[PDB]
């Protein structure tokens, strides 16, 4: 078959969690960077973007836009979405929480300086009182190596992706959560993830 | 019977009310009225991220809108036949949610920004979203968005068409197929029942 093709800017943005997930799944893919406005216009004009926006991933005859659509399909194809419907609910619950926190951090740079030193305080407070304790609690509930069904899933990947960004913001934030640390160590040590974390992978830098 | 915990309002629960009801599911609701109605669910451990919507369903307490919806869509055979169908469904409904979201928080928009944000929402409706969906209907000529059969995508799009009608009734005017769909979907027994006075269908907010 043809290798999936990822169309985005040569940046993290809204395409990174897809890069992490496909790499974690050991899926080989090609990137096509948008590097000019005219490049993006090429895409619209050719009819490649349903809602005129990227990320778009070409995969299995499809031109999938919308991060959640692209990720849902990849997680499913490569068996990282639970073994049943109830497992998918826990997974969706977890990863939607991660997306919410993700979202905040993603857009934190593109706001005013006036709204900034409170939005940061508000992010850090939610990490430490809402988000991190909830994932710790889940890992403590079962004592197992993965978040769901004692098997690696997209929740592990997306959370560990998130714990990497949380590190860049403030490395002290995980410090009271030992099981999250252990998870971040365990997942970074999986062969595919470890390859992704190595220099030269498709992992992107911060802005 | 599933139990919706939300405020007595549309909010982030309404699209679940539509979907439950389209699928012939009787649910109960439990309305939060005070900040200490909310505060009870948090300390009771009922909310994973201390937030509503929450649905009690099949022994789970599911939070996050997308988790609830995905679960209900699959359980009631409204999520397509396979992963490729779901992907087209996901692509479509995430587009819908993106527009839904802009419309959902128009009321809470800073008042000096409201004029531009409203004007931008209409531009997107007219140029981005409504044509994408007209083009889909026109490409297969079939009565439903996906798989020649009822899916959550038809339900979510129709719901949106009603919020767009409340905003500006001219917007749908040159989208014949969107018009045709809104009509056919609103005459499905369960939906017609939902649109009738005295259902769990919630009003627009006003203050």
UniProtKB/Swiss-Prot annotation, chain A:
Modified residues (N6-succinyllysine): 3
Binding site for glutathione: 8, 44, 53-54, 66-67
Segments forming domain GST N-terminal: 2-82
GO biological-process terms attached to the record: epithelial cell differentiation; glutathione derivative biosynthetic process; glutathione metabolic process; linoleic acid metabolic process; prostaglandin metabolic process; xenobiotic metabolic process
Listed EC numbers: 2.5.1.18, 1.11.1.-, 5.3.3.-
UniProt keywords, alphabetically: Acetylation, Cytoplasm, Isomerase, Lipid metabolism, Oxidoreductase, Peroxidase, Transferase
Modification sites for N-acetylalanine: 1
Name used for this protein in its record: Glutathione S-transferase A1
Annotated source species: Homo sapiens
Gene: GSTA1
Swiss-Prot record, chain B:
Start and end residues of each GST N-terminal domain: 1-80
Signal peptide positions on this chain: none
Modified residues (N6-succinyllysine): 1
Catalytic activity: RX + glutathione = an S-substituted glutathione + a halide anion + H(+); prostaglandin A2 + glutathione = prostaglandin A2-S-(R)-glutathione; prostaglandin J2 + glutathione = prostaglandin J2-S-(R)-glutathione; (13S)-hydroperoxy-(9Z,11E)-octadecadienoate + 2 glutathione = (13S)-hydroxy-(9Z,11E)-octadecadienoate + glutathione disulfide + H2O
pH dependence statement: Optimum pH is 8.0 for the isomerization of androst-5-ene-3,17-dione.
Annotated EC: 2.5.1.18, 1.11.1.-, 5.3.3.-
Subcellular location, record wording: Cytoplasm
BP GO annotations: epithelial cell differentiation; glutathione derivative biosynthetic process; glutathione metabolic process; linoleic acid metabolic process; prostaglandin metabolic process; xenobiotic metabolic process
Tissue: Liver.
Entry coiled-coil feature ranges: none
Keyword Cytoplasm attached: yes
SUPFAM superfamilies: GST C-terminal domain-like, Thioredoxin-like
Classification via PROSITE patterns: GST_CTER, GST_NTER
Similarity field: Belongs to the GST superfamily. Alpha family.
PANTHER family: GLUTATHIONE S-TRANSFERASE, GLUTATHIONE S-TRANSFERASE A1
Domain remark from Swiss-Prot or TrEMBL: The C-terminal domain may form a component of the hydrophobic substrate-binding site, but in contrast appears not to be directly involved in GSH binding and is not absolutely essential for catalytic activity.
Quaternary structure note: Homodimer or heterodimer of GSTA1 and GSTA2.
Protein name as it appears in the record: Glutathione S-transferase A1
């Amino acid at each position: 078959a043809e290798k999936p093709k990822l169309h985005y800017f040569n940046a993290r943005g809204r395409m990174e969690s897809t890069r992490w997930l496909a790499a974690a799944a050991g899926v080989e893919f090609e990137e096509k960077f948008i590097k000019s406005a005219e490049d993006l216009d090429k895409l619209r004009n050719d009819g490649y973007l349903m809602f005129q926006q990227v990320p778009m991933v070409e995969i299995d005859g499809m031109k999938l836009v919308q991060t959640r659509a692209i990720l849902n399909y990849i997680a499913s194809k490569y068996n990282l979405y639970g073994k049943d419907i109830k497992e998918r609910a826990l997974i969706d619950m977890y990863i939607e929480g991660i997306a919410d926190l993700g979202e905040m951090i993603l857009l934190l740079p593109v706001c005013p300086p006036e709204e900034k030193d409170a939005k940061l305080a508000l992010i850090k407070e939610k990490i430490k009182n809402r988000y991190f304790p909830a994932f710790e609690k889940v890992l403590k509930s079962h004592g197992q190596d993965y978040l769901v069904g004692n098997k690696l899933s997209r929740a592990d990947i997306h959370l560990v992706e998130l714990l990497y960004y949380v590190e860049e913001l403030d490395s002290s934030l995980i410090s009271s959560f030992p099981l999250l640390k252990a998870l971040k160590t365990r997942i970074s040590n999986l062969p595919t993830v470890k390859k992704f974390l190595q220099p030269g992978s498709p992992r992107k830098p911060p802005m």
